[PDB]
Design a protein around this ligand. Structure first.
Ligand SMILES: C[C@H]1O[C@@H](O)[C@H](O)[C@@H](O)[C@H]1O
Ligand SMILES: C[C@H]1O[C@@H](O)[C@H](O)[C@@H](O)[C@H]1O
Lengths: 262, 249
């Protein structure tokens, strides 16, 4: 009547965030005696629904969704119903308020793909920080979490440069931004300040070490397992969890040149 | 019904990309994927095999430090040939003092990349120097490089993976050493980031996703009664970017 297995539908496993979330889920599920059924969905319409009903056939005790989407109990790692997530909006606010506090006023944003709710939330936290400072929000370039998209977006921004700081919506894209800036001969942070998001292990060894917003991906996945176990069993009503984000100040930000003329 | 996989070091690109290829190869062939993770104790994999066996799994795939039918990592990439070509390239550029930052010696990739580097130098008549050991992480590459720079008796460093090579580049730039104008650096994997390092990293390409797909390909033949197939080997490729050059000695 029970399988002692947990189904998980995740995407973007080539990146650090979803992998470490998957690491947190596997370790917590195993420490409570649960095997893990892993399903990956691609950029395909409603492929998660196909994967959920596949897990349902495997008599799973519960399901954790780590992907954009929307009975065996289900837990989502977004908003939507039980949810476990990091305050993305407040994190982008910290990143943008960091730059504003240094004197930057023309702060570009390279965002993720809009089908990810985190990308929209980080966009709005950036916009609201500039609006509170009385600044109109510039035109936003869109990436896809890849370093290539960051590098390509930064080259577009450099065609007619009107910024002193770039907020890349994650660290992967920030690496490409750093690349494009070095190519053009621009120093970081002296000519252009760069802030990322995620705090992936590589970011501390970028050139220069990148200021970023830390997400605890592992604990995110463990808390998701804790929420799902409480619903599988003699409970169900869970606390909607919000994990706090943390700004990791390193070496890629500095007051702009011509500080008092910004 | 289902397929079992025991893997480790999922926070790295390589193991995660292999798992991606295993998942898609089983999703298209009607198999669900059971995931078991091991850490550093080698008595955890045999414990994780028996767990999937109790779950009545049709086949297991081992992607961790290894030795009804499991496919163990056979399917592989010629690690020895990969590091041998990288060392030969540096020698061809004129380097003669080529340091090696190896990986965890319990990993067969680490042991076999160190062998290809050693034997490439030995064929040339050169003596292999002392090796420093990392853990795949960017921190161990940075800390191993800083140790080398207490006595810079080299013009090139060969780090056993792109993660560690990023730490090496950081320790070199901190000490004001131009790359490759003063020190050449080579990695291994071709992670998506390495093309955007400062400078873009010369490295050896592994087809991780293909590696996982072949693991399921060989596994299904053992399940459907086609008997154990022969081992397969995927050739690695040397990708020469901007992090290598002849030395200025
Ligand atoms: C790929 C995608 O994965 C999530 O875990 C991260 O929060 C996000 O920044 C992005 O890196
Ligand atoms: C972390 C470890 O993962 C393996 O898949 C790679 O072959 C190796 O180079 C290293 O990256």
């Amino acid at each position: 009547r029970r399988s002692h297995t947990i189904g998980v539908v995740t995407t973007g496993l080539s990146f650090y965030g979803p992998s470490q979330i998957l690491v947190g889920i596997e370790r917590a599920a195993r420490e409570h005696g649960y095997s893990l059924l892993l399903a990956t969905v691609h950029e395909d319409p409603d492929e998660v629904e196909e994967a959920i009903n596949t897990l349902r056939e495997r008599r799973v005790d519960g399901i954790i969704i780590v992907a954009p989407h929307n009975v065996p109990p289900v837990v989502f790692l977004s908003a939507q119903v039980p949810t476990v997530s990091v305050d993305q909006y407040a994190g982008a606010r910290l990143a943008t308020e960091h730059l504003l506090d240094l004197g930057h006023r023309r702060i570009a944003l390279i965002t993720g793909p809009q089908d990810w709710l985190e990308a929209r939330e980080r966009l709005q936290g950036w916009r609201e920080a500039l609006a509170e400072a009385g600044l109109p929000p510039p035109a936003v370039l869109q990436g896809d979490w890849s370093a290539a998209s960051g590098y390509e977006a930064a080259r577009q921004l450099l065609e007619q440069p009107d910024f002193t700081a770039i907020f890349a919506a994650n660290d992967q894209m920030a690496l490409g931004v750093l690349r494009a800036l070095h190519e053009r001969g621009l120093r970081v942070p002296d000519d252009v300040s760069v802030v990322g998001f995620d705090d992936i292990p590589e970011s501390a060894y970028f050139h220069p070490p990148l200021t970023t917003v830390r997400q605890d991906f592992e604990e995110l996945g463990r808390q998701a397992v804790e929420q799902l176990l409480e619903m599988i069993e003699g409970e169900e009503p869970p606390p909607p969890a919000v994990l706090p984000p943390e700004l990791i100040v390193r070496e890629s930000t500095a007051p702009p040149e011509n500080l008092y003329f910004q």
